Write a protein that binds this ligand. Structure first.
Ligand code: NAG
Ligand code: NAG
Ligand code: NAG
Ligand code: NAG
Ligand code: NAG
Ligand code: NAG
Ligand code: NAG
Lengths: 49, 167, 49, 270
């Protein structure tokens, strides 16, 4: 019966999860971790990624 | 033994470093600093870098496991490589900073709300509500109508010398 | 500054974002995996030709 | 050592069985609690045709029954059902000769020896243990596996121990990826008399080694009990494939259950 509310909650949570998981996507860069790029490549190389 | 230094024996050791396109097997002494707990620090465990608060944990890590993740896949726990004890990682305290201000036409005195942060991580008339830490508001037991809604049922109004009172 | 105004009306205005940037850095690595036997070479009683 | 030659060589025919839902191993050293996680890795697909045979450890009686040489592909799941530790080691490589580097992973009575060298394996690798009547205990006294071993590339000897010379099921998973040879192992007390038992059990990581060699075939090594003069151990082999799995970690971080997405539409929905 409470589905109307429950779904709402779930939906919001779902979005957040997706948002958070978007931090683990490379998008074409060498890696999704910014610290790894900074510490492994020089700024001239880093900026491109 | 009586020869000149040029004709005396000399023991020579040459250290060469073979670096191939294969996983390495020899590393120099790993520089490990003393462990720090209950304070936002920039930690690094076996190459896993991060920033957070390291605290003693009750989690029952398996012997072979070195890290602990969550739904976000972010490092929620770690294992100290030297001493095999588990540490929980908490995000370094952060949050919005808002300003409860009665109209400047009324007064220039303002209170500052740090949203969702305990009243311990602020540098430095301090109220700890569920909304966050409110600094510059005098907590009042008397209850009036809501004037400037801070949140969690707490509203702050400028009233009687006059100051900002949260209730 | 946030309001781009000189008159601020009564309210609560989200102005900034407060962070607690760490005081120090901590590095923890496995102290011992196996002792490289340099003493067996340097401290060898007899050397080869 | 010097190879022992057998005039008569034979090998029993293979048989097939259903893998049920075994072969799940922890993909990473991460700890996850009371969650479900989807991983794309080299797993043993549920209900896969598994090729199993028997390894004879006693002669009674001049016929040498030799194990077969099986491909390696991208990894192999190897189960052994036995009372005593009959299966002792494995040999991996492409040519299994001095021409190319070969790996030997054995668990002798003393310790576990792992050697990556240009081995020249014997035609019929032999390990022989004789019963010491005075000491009332078996003692290994013959080891003739490879004729030669040159240009060794890796060596690792575990600490000495005493191996004991109601069945035991020892599951192993060998995976060669990115120049790393990963071995996962699990040991369970199984009361079944014959056949691969049906059930689920995760495999804890045993050891990963940076051998960095190419492997395409391997073979099993059994122990022989020399007697003055029937319960032969059995072993099953399956081949890992790139599969998507949904693993369920309980509160204690243990993989209680797993679901194979590509098995059936219901699992795809799951
Ligand atoms: C390395 O750390 C372990 C962890 O307790 C300790 O037992 C050992 O003595 C340490 N060895 C050295 C050489 O510091
Ligand atoms: C300040 O506010 C009061 C009432 O709140 C109003 O009467 C007065 O005109 C205001 N002053 C200015 C300068 O706007
Ligand atoms: C703030 O920290 C103190 C001590 O660490 C704790 O007792 C208190 O409950 C915390 N505040 C909140 C709102 O949890
Ligand atoms: C408000 O009342 C509570 C109990 O009713 C008391 O403990 C607290 O000290 C009061 N606060 C002030 C500011 O008087
Ligand atoms: C060689 O041995 C001496 C004592 O026998 C010791 O003081 C020295 O540190 C050793 N050198 C090395 C390289 O281990
Ligand atoms: C396994 O293979 C054999 C012959 O290769 C076949 O008869 C059998 O049906 C297969 N198993 C399954 C479950 O299909
Ligand atoms: C998890 O492990 C602890 C270790 O003692 C045990 O007490 C507990 O029962 C385990 N949890 C479950 C659900 O079995």
């Amino acid at each position: 019966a409470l589905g109307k509310l429950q779904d709402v909650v779930n939906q919001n949570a779902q979005a957040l999860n997706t948002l958070v998981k978007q931090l683990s996507s490379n998008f074409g860069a060498i890696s999704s971790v910014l610290n790894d790029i900074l510490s492994r490549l020089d700024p001239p190389e880093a900026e491109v990624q | 033994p009586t020869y000149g230094v040029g004709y005396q024996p000399y023991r020579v050791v040459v250290l060469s470093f073979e670096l191939l396109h294969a996983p390495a097997t020899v590393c120099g002494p790993k520089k490990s600093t003393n462990l720090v707990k209950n304070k936002c620090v920039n930690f690094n465990f076996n190459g896993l870098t991060g920033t957070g608060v390291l605290t003693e944990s009750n989690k029952k890590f398996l012997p072979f496991q070195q890290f602990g993740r969550d739904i976000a896949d972010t490092t929620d726990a770690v294992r100290d490589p030297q001493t095999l004890e588990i540490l929980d990682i908490t995000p370094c305290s952060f949050g919005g900073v808002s300003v409860i201000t009665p109209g400047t036409n009324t007064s220039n005195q303002v209170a500052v709300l740090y949203q969702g942060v305990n009243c311990t991580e602020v540098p430095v008339n301090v109220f700890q509500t569920r909304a966050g830490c409110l600094i510059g508001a005098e907590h009042v037991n008397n209850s009036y109508e809501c004037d400037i809604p801070i949140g969690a049922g707490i509203c702050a109004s400028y009233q009687t010398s006059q100051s900002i009172i949260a209730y | 500054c946030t309001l781009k105004s000189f008159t601020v009306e009564k309210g609560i205005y989200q102005t900034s974002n407060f962070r607690v940037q760490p005081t120090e850095s901590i590095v923890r690595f496995p102290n011992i995996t196996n002792l490289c036997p340099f003493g067996e070479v340097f401290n060898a009683t007899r050397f080869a030709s | 050592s010097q190879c022992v030659n057998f005039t008569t060589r034979t090998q029993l025919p293979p048989a097939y069985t259903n893998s049920f839902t075994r072969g799940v191993y922890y993909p990473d050293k991460v700890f996850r609690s009371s969650v479900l996680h989807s991983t794309q890795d080299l797993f043993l697909p549920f209900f896969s045709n598994v090729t199993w045979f028997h390894a004879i450890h006693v002669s009674g009686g001049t016929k040498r029954f030799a194990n077969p040489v099986l491909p390696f592909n991208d990894g192999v799941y190897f189960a052994s059902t036995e009372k005593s530790n009959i299966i002792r080691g494995w040999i991996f490589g492409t040519t299994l000769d001095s021409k190319t580097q070969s790996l030997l992973i054995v668990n002798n009575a003393t310790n576990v020896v792992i050697k990556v060298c240009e081995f020249q394996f014997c035609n019929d690798p032999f390990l022989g243990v004789y019963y010491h009547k005075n000491n009332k205990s078996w003692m290994e006294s013959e080891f003739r596996v490879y004729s030669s071993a040159n240009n060794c590339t890796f060596e690792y000897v575990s600490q000495p121990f005493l191996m004991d010379l109601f069945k035991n099921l020892r599951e192993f998973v060998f995976k060669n990826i990115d120049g790393y040879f990963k071995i996962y192992s699990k040991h369970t007390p199984i009361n079944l008399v014959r056949g691969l038992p049906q059930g689920f059990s995760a495999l804890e990581p045993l050891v990963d080694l940076p051998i960095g060699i190419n492997i395409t075939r391997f073979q099993t090594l059994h122990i022989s009990y020399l007697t003055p003069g029937a319960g032969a151990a059995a072993y099953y082999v399956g081949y890992l494939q790139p599969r998507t799995f949904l693993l369920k970690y309980n509160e204690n971080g243990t993989i209680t259950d797993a679901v194979d997405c590509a098995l059936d539409p219901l699992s795809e929905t799951k």
